[PDB]
Design a protein around this motif. Structure first.
Motif, short mmCIF file in Angstrom:
data_model
loop_
_atom_site.label_atom_id
_atom_site.label_comp_id
_atom_site.label_asym_id
_atom_site.label_seq_id
_atom_site.Cartn_x
_atom_site.Cartn_y
_atom_site.Cartn_z
N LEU B 4 17.89 10.51 -112.80
CA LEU B 4 16.96 11.10 -113.76
C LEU B 4 16.76 10.23 -114.99
CD1 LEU B 4 19.86 12.78 -114.37
CD2 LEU B 4 18.55 12.21 -116.41
N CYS B 128 12.95 13.20 -112.20
CA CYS B 128 14.15 13.31 -111.37
C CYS B 128 13.79 12.89 -109.95
CB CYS B 128 14.67 14.74 -111.38
SG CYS B 128 15.89 15.12 -112.64
N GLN B 133 17.55 15.77 -106.53
CA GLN B 133 16.64 15.86 -107.68
C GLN B 133 16.41 17.30 -108.15
OE1 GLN B 133 13.10 13.99 -105.88
NE2 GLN B 133 12.05 15.98 -105.94
N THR B 134 16.35 18.23 -107.20
CA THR B 134 16.06 19.64 -107.50
C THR B 134 17.17 20.29 -108.33
OG1 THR B 134 17.02 20.29 -105.37
CG2 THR B 134 14.63 20.02 -105.46
N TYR B 137 16.94 18.81 -111.91
CA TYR B 137 15.78 19.41 -112.59
C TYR B 137 16.11 20.76 -113.23
CZ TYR B 137 11.70 16.40 -111.59
OH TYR B 137 10.78 15.37 -111.59
N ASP B 141 15.43 21.25 -117.08
CA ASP B 141 14.36 22.15 -117.52
C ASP B 141 14.85 23.27 -118.44
OD1 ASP B 141 12.39 20.73 -116.17
OD2 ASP B 141 12.41 22.04 -114.41
N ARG F 171 8.81 24.29 -110.61
CA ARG F 171 9.00 23.11 -109.76
C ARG F 171 8.61 23.27 -108.29
NH1 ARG F 171 9.08 18.58 -113.00
NH2 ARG F 171 10.37 19.06 -114.85
N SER J 26 9.04 18.74 -104.82
CA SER J 26 8.96 19.08 -106.24
C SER J 26 7.60 18.76 -106.86
CB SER J 26 10.05 18.34 -107.02
OG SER J 26 11.33 18.82 -106.67
#
Ligand SMILES: [Mg+2]
Ligand SMILES: [Mg+2]
Ligand SMILES: [Mg+2]
Ligand SMILES: [Mg+2]
Ligand SMILES: [Mg+2]
Ligand SMILES: [Mg+2]
Lengths: 204, 212, 233, 222, 125, 195, 226, 196, 196, 195
Positions: B4, B128, B133-134, B137, B141, F171, J26
């Protein structure tokens, strides 16, 4: 796609002096996604211990199946099943699904109550018995486990030394496998006492 | 992989994991996913390791030639576009690249460009990239603010990689932290995930599901 | 990319105390059809090297011409062409190995497995393998195709490691090779009885033997074998 | 269809010491279930106190090693016989590998030697040129069998100091060349037992400031 | 054709007796004496070889039968019924035990299986 | 269908399930309740292939309702989850398997404990403090890992759930049209009508 | 796998290596490949290990029942016929490749069986991945009227060729000798030419090296009285 | 495989090579492809060894049961039983069988049953991979009512050529002679037939 | 197709059938497969008609240009030119060519060039789909230094059998005789060769 | 990318383009401007394969800007649209075609008329009163067919555009994160910052 590596995980079993040890990681996943860190893969029916790696639904199903069968065995035989006999039962049960098999890597471990002899055994998904003297490995880090066991293992280890050997064999093998880890359990089994130890390991 | 990078008051935080896998086999836990293009510019490594390494190293050569000819620091915009135009020439050949070109200049301020092997080039505040990545995030966020301190921003990047490292099987090993300022990037160390997890669990009270 | 059409089977070889032996049958198969019975697959280069070739015969003939051309080229502006600057087995092999790997890299291979057997200037035994992939390796015994599976085990019982080479005579080595050729004739469906054998010795030089035959075969026991299980008559 | 690649098996191991480096590799060469050679050297002295091995598909392995040795030679011609440092060699090899990005050398390359401060150095490459300085790296067939053992016995992973119970890690004390060679030999002995493509012989190249030394050991031939 | 006797031929009489079982026991009573004795380190089973004719080779008629390597059987009553029970007892020792557990059944369980077969002939159609 | 979440707090289980039903190109419905009450204190949410989801859920419902009548007794959440797992484990080797993933949120009246069970279409059962199916976990688990406590109140669980849904809405590429939230506790099952 | 069968003067001998593999990994270094169909009928299996073991136990079981039914010692041709008809029925899906050997009242016998149900008769046979290495040795040294001692030597030499030259085979040589008018003698680990050398180092850990979270006693005993 | 059956004055002779291959590996170099389904009814087998053995064993069973009830079967009857199995199971079989037999009434008869499961009564029949190479030779050299010695030479020369050109064929040439006199087995080794 | 070339005492004779098929349809029943690349160097063509015609035309061009510069080419030279084309373009050709020629120095020579593009100098050569059926016959009946009449009979009998068994072969048997005397064309019709 | 709409009213052209950029799983960005100003009175929106879209749009922009400098003159929207069509028509038979669909909204200063051109990746040009690419037209054209008038004001066009976007937000499965709206008229190009 490959059923034996969707959920991940490992089991290792070792023999020592008047004792056996069986150990497993605690991970259950959906490929890359970690789902559970409490999915124990070792079960026991009386004094006979069974580890099962592979597809988690089958791990659960086979545990329930062998509980079922060893319970009926005990009622009719009027005695607890022995490791040698149970090994044959596991083999028979897997091979009856020859052309629709459970995607598992079972590992039997225990001490014969009458002879006092330490016993371990492994199987492929289809029932072929691997009755090794030294150690049995199974799961998505079986190569790593073979490497660890082959170098770390020596025969006739005392229970508390065997614990260190099998633990280090599991931990370091699991740390080289993406789909294994998230905690670990080690069973040290003697003729009339069994100690269960949860290991501290990296959680990634 | 989890990488990231996000813009904030104090510049840019870049945070990456360290794990490299070949299938289920963990090939390395000590991989460098931040390419130090030059003392001012950073690039992240996701997708193809060689593709990212080679071309972002090549990248530093192009920037060095730019500032020799033009007697001026190359912009992050020009910087990222050299890479995106390059990979776009190779489009279809099978390059695998997902990177953040991160820099802090006078004219632009702190800037992040997401560059892609499909030719995508996106300027943004938070990016990211990778298999985890999820997870990163989510932490980003919910906790991100422009007015974060350099200390808190560094921790947020570290904590977000930890979140991914824990859940994503193909992320872990260790966390590498960077802080990009106008005068250049500053390295903020290698942090083993194994030791970091327990440390964070205790101090933060998070990961109650996990027994420690 | 092609497919092999006319093919030659096993080439077998081994080192002994004073040199090397190499052998290969005289068959050019056309699939299961045993089409050509007079094909020489051992091609000598000078008086110190023999190149044994298996696989595609058309590519073998091309390689045969390259080696012939190599000798011509080496003699150009070379007063020592028949002395100090003569072609060595190592030169011939490295050349072929270069060609084989170049051709596989252009996705247009020479569909062969080659064994270069010879004796160097200093008397050293040379035995090395190269194939359509450009893969190379050396060993006291080398064999291609079926020879690898059946000849090597037998030849390795004679020379199991480097230290067995000085203990192995040319008579013992040749005997083992000839026996291996018999075994291959029993068991390889794409082999013939007729073969050629070449010996490259540091003292007696190149001895090239043509029109050899597999002999002393055991078949008598076949008469007693009846049916496939229960049949008695 | 023609398959330009093949698998010649083999396993290699590079370990960086404090003032030395070892690059080991078994001497067995195979295709499928057959042994091509019981002794086919796989680790090479490339000059300038650099040792190299390109394990996997042997034809590409030999081609790469040959081209790198050539690069060392031309580096001397072009730059006044300057010694090619291990880091410079590593970067050069990346370009050799990435040069064939779309038709790769099917090998896992490892080089070893000393850095410009005299410390032990090992570099590890993937088939297309992504590389990395490392302390410890097994490559090839039995790499998965060897690396976990090395994590445990070289880096002391998962090992803690008795009495503390997980609170104090075992300290990362420096290993001597004699100690490293013991771990290399046991790694290959174990790999030989459990991997069919590993065996016959073990050849170790040891690099120090004094130069390159070789050690050979027998392995099981089954 | 078809076996149209799908009903029980053994039934409870008003007095609560199962006639066909009692009559079967009467047939056993007429049968030649056989006995069994258990020792500390073994068991013995014995019977008389009542030869139907002196021309008959009584060695070919085995009243005492091996069921498993460690289990033997002897009878009194109808010989043909015994013979088929021995066949079934041998097979059931494999099918319902040895092919599952990789070992021969213990005496009591093999006896249990034989008993089950004899019970079913007392209730089945 | 798409997103189904579950969280077990101190004294209840909360299930959040998306309202969208998309058949290819169009969103046919934005108020679909992807759940069935199996017994007064046991709720099951579900997501998977169209038709199979509801067919399976109602089949389970009928079986548990049958058991409840026969024995005049409510099965424990553990007992229900084991029954459900077996049906799915049976299903996976069938001619045409049920392509259905479920969360079983129940309150055990005997033990006075909330219980959340996650079971996928293979018959993979796990008891969890919080769970999800499909891609839902990828976005939400990092938040749940951070904030979750076993002694959370129902109101705190709902707040953490809102944060999870907000992250999903930010997202996720798909518009799942919000979620229906239901709470399972000692008093039974009730729907949070404003979320 | 390397398995061989060799006929001799007054009987037959079979032999096998002791390596079982999953891919390139050696699962068991001392596997028992010589299986008993009946006391004097033994067989060695290659291919799918579960199938070879399963099919020999099934036929061995039916052979025992047949022997009891007929009051006769089992014949090799019966084992052969029952094996081939079973394997043929499953059209090769049961991956059992067997060398069946034995003695019976008819005499001494040696057969091979392939997974699709085809059988062959011979004086010397080899099966498995090392069959070519083994057959090379058999073709080089086999002769008519071998003695018991010569056949054991030839059989084990053929297995050795597989052990050394075939990567699919290794470790030890198992032998079983079935002579007419005698008990079959099973020679487990007849040769042991692959003992691992002593390691350079002991890897026994200091006690307390492993980090532990929890300890507990597992109750393996039944529910107790009082 | 190279197999043939040839009728002659005194009866019929079946001939065959002894090579059985798995790819290019000769799995058995001394195979007996001449198999007995009745006293004086034999067959030559080509195709799947498993299939042709399974078929032959079933036919032998059928003719044994036939004999117990109705006495000795005709060669035609044996061929019919072969055909019935081959035709009805054509989707799952790869069998090319030549049936040859000797009656006293009918004398020597030869029936060939190719892949499809059809039946063809012939004076002589050739089959197997190696047969392709001797269609010309056999057609030019076959005569009806040959002597025993002539027929042996004809088969020996024919299979010699089949073996010479077909890599799938080889080893020894086995023959079985069916006449009123009885059943005679013959074998001919490479050193004999290769020099022809 | 059934084609062959046979050397004999006075030189060489090329032989061929005349059938050209597209599947089972005979597109040409009177094809001339014996084609001239030089005065006394001819060839038999099998495989792709387009390919073998294209090759032969190029060879004829090469030998015509060779002759203008260096005089009459050898049969070996002609075979080499054929080989060069067939070998170098093996990926895009389906050509099986037999080259036959008559020198005064070398006399009758036969070279066969199969699919791969290899060259094999032989006393006689057979090729084409129908050749498979006469390997046995030709091997048994060929002799070296036959007379013209014997060689014509050998070729006629051989191709007669090839035609009899191969559906892809048929029509007339064309032959071309190459000797010092010159070039003689022969033709033999079905009514003649079928009764052989 | 996803949705791009265009509507030509009385005295202007309005282009609405989605803000979402999704790379697989995403949504990487929710403020992406899928448009380039080719000349002061000509705007081009675009949607298609990643990388190709922006590469093509900027390539066109550079070429029109070059022409503007060389001739000191702004090309008519028709001229620009023909140039763009040719580039796409050239592209479709290339080694690797531009996978890009565009709308060209321009105000012709000579004719004093707004002009909307729809061009797909094949080079299929059509002049329209309102247009779209991909699935956008499937949801919106029925509304545009009903309400559209050639004498609409800019404010009425925006209201009809809002109705189109609302229908998209209701029935489309994908969350395209709203739209950036731009107006092209005699005074040039401007962005409606609140929509
Ligand atoms: Mg892990
Ligand atoms: Mg992880
Ligand atoms: Mg080994
Ligand atoms: Mg689940
Ligand atoms: Mg079949
Ligand atoms: Mg032959």
């Amino acid at each position: 796609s490959d059923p034996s590596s969707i959920n991940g995980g490992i089991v290792v079993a070792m023999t020592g002096k008047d004792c056996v040890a069986i150990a497993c990681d605690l991970r259950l996943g959906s490929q890359s996604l970690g789902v559970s860190n409490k999915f124990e893969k070792i079960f026991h029916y009386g004094h006979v211990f069974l580890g099962i790696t592979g597809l988690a639904t089958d791990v659960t199903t086979l545990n329930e199946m062998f509980r079922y069968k060893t319970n009926l065995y005990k009622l009719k035989e009027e005695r607890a099943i022995e490791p040698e006999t149970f090994t044959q039962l596991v083999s028979s049960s897997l091979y009856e699904r020859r052309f629709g098999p459970y995607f598992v890597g079972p590992v039997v471990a225990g001490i014969n109550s009458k002879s006092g002899k330490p016993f371990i055994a492994g199987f492929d998904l289809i029932g072929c018995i691997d009755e090794a003297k030294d150690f049995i490995v199974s799961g998505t880090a079986s190569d790593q486990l073979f490497g660890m066991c082959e170098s770390l293992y020596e025969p006739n280890l005392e229970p508390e030394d065997l614990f260190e050997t099998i633990s280090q064999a599991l931990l370091n093998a699991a740390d080289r496998d993406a789909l294994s880890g998230w905690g670990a359990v080690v069973y040290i089994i003697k003729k009339d006492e069994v100690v269960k130890r949860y290991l501290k390991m990296r959680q990634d | 992989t989890t990488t990231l990078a996000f813009r904030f008051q104090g510049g840019i935080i870049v945070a990456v994991d360290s794990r490299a896998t070949a299938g289920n086999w963990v090939a390395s836990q000590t991989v460098k996913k931040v390419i130090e293009i030059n003392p001012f510019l950073l690039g992240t490594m996701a997708g193809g390791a060689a593709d990212c390494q080679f071309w972002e190293t090549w990248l530093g050569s192009q920037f060095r030639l730019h500032e020799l000819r033009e007697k001026e620091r190359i912009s992050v915009a020009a910087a990222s576009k050299i890479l995106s135009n390059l990979v776009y020439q190779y489009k279809g050949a099978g390059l695998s690249m997902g990177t953040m070109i991160c820099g802090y200049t006078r004219k632009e301020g702190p800037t992040i460009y997401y560059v892609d092997s499909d030719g995508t080039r996106l300027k943004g505040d938070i990016f990211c990239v990778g298999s985890g990545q999820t997870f990163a995030y989510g932490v980003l966020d919910s906790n991100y603010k422009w007015d974060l301190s350099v200390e808190d921003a560094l921790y947020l990047g570290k904590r977000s990689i930890l979140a991914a490292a824990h859940r994503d099987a193909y992320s872990g090993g260790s966390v590498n932290l960077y802080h990009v300022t106008e005068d250049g990037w500053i390295y903020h160390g290698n942090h083993d995930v194994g030791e970091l997890f327990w440390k964070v669990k205790e101090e933060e009270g998070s990961f109650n599901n996990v027994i420690g | 990319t092609q497919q092999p059409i006319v093919t030659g089977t096993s080439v077998i070889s081994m080192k002994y105390d004073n040199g090397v032996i190499i052998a290969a049958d005289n068959l050019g198969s056309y699939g299961s059809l045993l089409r050509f019975n007079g094909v020489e697959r051992l091609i000598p280069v000078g008086d110190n090297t023999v190149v044994g070739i298996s696989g595609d015969i058309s590519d073998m003939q091309h390689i045969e011409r390259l080696l012939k051309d190599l000798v011509t080229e080496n003699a150009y502006d070379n007063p020592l062409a028949d002395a100090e600057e003569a072609l060595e087995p190592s030169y011939i092999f490295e050349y072929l190995a270069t060609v084989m790997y170049q051709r596989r890299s252009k996705m247009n291979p020479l569909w062969n497995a080659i064994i270069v057997a010879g004796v160097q200037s200093n008397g050293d035994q040379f035995l090395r393998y190269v194939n359509l992939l450009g893969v190379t390796y050396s060993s006291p015994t080398l064999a291609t195709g079926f020879g690898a599976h059946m000849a090597n085990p037998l030849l390795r019982k004679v020379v199991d490691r480097e230290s067995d080479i000085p203990k192995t005579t040319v008579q013992v080595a040749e005997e083992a090779i000839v026996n291996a050729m018999r075994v291959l004739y029993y068991r390889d469906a794409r082999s013939s009885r007729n073969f050629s054998l070449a010996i490259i010795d540091k003292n007696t030089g190149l001895t090239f033997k043509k029109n050899l035959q597999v002999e002393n075969m055991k078949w008598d026991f076949a008469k007693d074998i009846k049916g496939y299980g229960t049949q008695k008559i | 269809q023609f398959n330009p690649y093949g698998d010649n098996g083999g396993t290699i191991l590079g370990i960086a010491g404090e003032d030395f480096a070892v690059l080991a590799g078994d001497t067995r060469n195979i295709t499928d279930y057959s042994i091509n050679s019981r002794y086919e050297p796989k680790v090479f002295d490339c000059g300038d106190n650099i040792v190299m091995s390109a394990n996997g598909f042997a034809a590409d392995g030999d081609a790469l090693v040959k081209r790198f040795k050539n690069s060392v030679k031309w580096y001397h011609f072009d730059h006044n016989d300057k010694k090619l440092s291990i880091n410079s060699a590593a970067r050069n090899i990346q370009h050799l590998l990435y040069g064939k990005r779309f038709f790769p050398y099917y090998v896992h390359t490892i080089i070893a030697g000393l850095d410009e401060d005299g410390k032990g150095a090992v570099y590890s490459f993937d088939p297309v040129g992504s590389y990395e300085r490392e302390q410890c790296r097994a490559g090839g067939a039995a790499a998965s069998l060897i690396m976990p053992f090395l994590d445990n016995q070289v880096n002391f992973k998962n090992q803690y100091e008795p009495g503390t119970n997980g609170k104090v890690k075992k300290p990362l004390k420096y290993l001597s060349v004699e100690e490293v060679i013991k771990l290399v030999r046991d790694s290959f002995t174990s790999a030989t037992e459990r991997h069919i493509q590993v065996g016959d012989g073990l050849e170790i190249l040891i690099v120090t400031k004094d130069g390159v030394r070789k050690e050979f050991y027998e392995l099981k031939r089954d | 054709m078809t076996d149209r006797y799908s009903f029980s031929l053994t039934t409870f009489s008003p007095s609560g007796k199962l006639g066909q079982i009692d009559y079967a026991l009467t047939a056993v009573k007429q049968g030649v004496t056989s006995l069994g004795i258990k020792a500390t380190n073994g068991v013995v089973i014995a019977t008389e070889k009542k030869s139907s004719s002196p021309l008959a080779m009584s060695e070919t008629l085995s009243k005492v039968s091996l069921l498993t390597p460690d289990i033997g059987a002897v009878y009194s009553g109808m010989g043909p019924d015994y013979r088929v029970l021995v066949d079934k007892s041998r097979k059931v020792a494999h099918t319902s035990y040895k092919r599952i557990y990789g070992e021969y059944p213990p005496t009591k369980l093999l006896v249990s299986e034989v008993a089950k077969i004899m019970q079913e002939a007392t209730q089945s159609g | 269908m798409d997103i189904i979440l579950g969280i077990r707090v101190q004294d209840s289980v909360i299930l959040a399930s998306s309202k969208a039903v998309t058949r290819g190109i169009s969103v046919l419905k934005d108020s679909d309740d992807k759940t069935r009450q199996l017994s007064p204190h046991t709720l099951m949410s579900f997501a998977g292939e169209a038709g199979d989801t509801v067919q399976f859920a109602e089949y389970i419902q009928a079986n548990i309702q049958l058991y409840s009548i026969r024995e005049d007794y409510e099965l424990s959440p553990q007992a229900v989850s084991s029954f459900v797992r077996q049906e799915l484990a049976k299903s996976i080797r069938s001619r045409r398997p049920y392509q259905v993933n479920v969360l079983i949120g129940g309150y055990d009246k005997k033990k006075n404990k909330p219980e959340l069970y996650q079971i996928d279409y293979l018959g993979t059962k796990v008891e969890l403090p919080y769970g999800a199916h499909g891609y839902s976990g990828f976005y939400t688990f990092s938040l749940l890992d951070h904030h979750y406590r076993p002694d959370m109140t129902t109101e705190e669980g709902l707040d953490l759930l809102k944060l999870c849904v907000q992250e999903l809405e930010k997202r996720m590429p798909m518009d799942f049209k919000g979620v229906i939230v239901k709470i399972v506790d000692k008093d039974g099952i009730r729907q949070v009508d404003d979320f | 796998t390397t398995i061989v069968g060799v006929k001799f003067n007054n009987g037959v001998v079979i032999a096998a290596d002791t390596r079982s593999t999953q891919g390139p990994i050696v699962a068991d270094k001392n596997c028992a490949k010589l299986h008993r169909i009946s006391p004097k009928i033994w067989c060695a299996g290659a291919g799918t290990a579960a199938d070879t073991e399963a099919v020999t136990q099934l036929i061995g079981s039916n052979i025992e029942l047949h022997s009891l039914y007929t009051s006769r010692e089992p014949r090799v041709v019966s084992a052969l016929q029952m094996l081939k008809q079973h394997l043929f029925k499953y059209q090769g899906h049961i991956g059992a490749y067997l060398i069946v050997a034995g003695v019976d009242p008819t005499g001494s016998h040696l057969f091979s069986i392939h997974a699709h149900g085809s059988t062959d008769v011979g004086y010397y046979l080899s099966l498995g991945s090392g069959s070519l290495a083994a057959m090379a040795v058999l073709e080089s040294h086999w002769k008519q009227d071998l003695t018991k001692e010569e056949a054991i030597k030839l059989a084990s030499d053929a297995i050795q060729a597989g052990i050394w030259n075939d990567l699919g085979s290794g470790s030890n040589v198992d032998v079983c000798v079935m002579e007419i008018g005698k008990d079959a003698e099973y020679l487990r680990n007849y040769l042991t030419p692959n003992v691992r050398e002593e390691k350079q180092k002991s890897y026994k850990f200091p006690r307390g090296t492993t980090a532990v979270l929890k300890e507990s006693i597992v109750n393996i005993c039944d529910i107790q009285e009082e | 495989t190279s197999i043939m059956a040839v009728t002659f004055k005194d009866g019929v002779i079946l001939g065959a090579d002894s090579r059985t291959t798995t790819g290019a590996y000769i799995a058995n170099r001394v195979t007996d492809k001449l198999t007995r389904v009745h006293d004086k009814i034999w067959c030559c087998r080509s195709g799947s060894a498993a299939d042709t053995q399974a078929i032959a064993d079933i036919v032998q069973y059928h003719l044994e049961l036939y004999t117990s009830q109705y006495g000795t079967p005709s060669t035609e009857t044996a061929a019919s039983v072969f055909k019935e199995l081959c035709y009805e199971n054509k989707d799952n079989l790869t069998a090319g069988i030549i049936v040859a037999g000797y009656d006293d009434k009918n004398k020597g008869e030869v029936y060939t049953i190719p892949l499809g499961g059809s039946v063809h009564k012939l004076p002589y029949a050739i089959a197997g991979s190696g047969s392709t190479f001797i269609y010309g030779y056999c057609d030019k050299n076959f005569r009806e009512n040959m002597s025993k010695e002539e027929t042996v030479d004809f088969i020996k020369h024919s299979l010699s050529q089949a073996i010479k050109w077909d890599g799938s064929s080889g080893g020894v040439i086995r023959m079985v002679v069916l006449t009123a006199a009885g059943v005679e087995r013959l074998i001919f080794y490479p050193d004999e037939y290769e020099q022809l």
